[PDB]
């Protein structure tokens, strides 16, 4: 039976799915014109960049 | 430095490529009461590519 | 606490250049305001006088 230790495997899967999704959240343009900070400071001035 | 532009309905698009544009050389022309940039600042142009 | 009134003349279409976090030959090479500025800026006509 390959699904015998699913209770334990779910743990390491959720812990991975918790961080992996947390990495994709960096692509989320939260009310911003870009999700990369270096692109903002390079395209806008500090007053409008902040 | 052109003599006569076109109408608002027949505006003439002037494609520009394979060059290096020093936008500072535009200010020395007629006054610019409005130099608004909606995606970037009017200063970060000489540091970015297009 | 401490108020200072800095003054200098500009011949018209250059007033928008004096702002915290701005670049140019009149900003990096002439007069620069800080990024943590706390004050106000003024600009006005002085025809007959000058």
Burial C5-33 (b: 16+ CB within 10 A, else e): eeeeeeeeeeeebbebbbbbeebeeeeee
Cα gap C42→C20, rounded to integer Å? 14
Q: What is the CA radius of gyration of chain A?
A: 19
Instruction: Give residues with Cβ within 8 angstroms of A25, minimum separation 6.
Output: none
Q: Residue B27 is inside which H or E element, if any?
A: helix B24-27
Dihedral of alpha carbons B21, B26, B28, B33, sign: negative
What is the experimental resolution, given in Å to one decimal place? 3.6
**Chain centroid offset of residue C16 CA:** 8
Interchain contact, B44 vs A44, CB within 8 Å:
yes
Nearest chain C residue to B36 by CA distance is C16
C17 contact partners, CB below 8 Å, separation of at least 6: C24, C26, C27
Interface contact C35-A45, CB threshold 8 A = no
* Residue C17 near residue A42, CB atoms below 8 Å: no
Which residue blocks in chain C are alpha helix, DSSP H? none
- Touching partners of C (3+ C-beta pairs < 8 Å): A, B
| C-alpha distances out from residue B46 to A42, B15, C31, Å | 11, 19, 20
């Amino acid at each position: 039976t390959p699904s015998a230790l699913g209770k334990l495997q779910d743990v390491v899967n959720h812990n991975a799915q918790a961080l992996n999704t947390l990495v994709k959240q960096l692509s989320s343009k939260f009310g911003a014109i870009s999700s990369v900070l270096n692109d903002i400071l390079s395209r806008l001035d500090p007053p409008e960049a902040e | 430095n052109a003599t006569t532009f076109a109408s608002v309905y027949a505006w003439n698009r002037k494609r520009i490529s394979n060059c290096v544009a020093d936008y500072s050389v535009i200010y020395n022309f007629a006054p610019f009461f409005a130099f608004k940039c909606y995606g970037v600042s009017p200063t970060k142009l000489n540091d970015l590519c297009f | 606490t401490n108020v200072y009134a800095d003054s200098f003349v500009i011949r018209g279409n250059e007033v928008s250049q004096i702002a915290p976090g701005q670049t140019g030959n009149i900003a990096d090479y002439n007069y620069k305001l800080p990024d943590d500025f706390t004050g106000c800026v003024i600009a006005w006509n002085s025809n007959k006088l000058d």
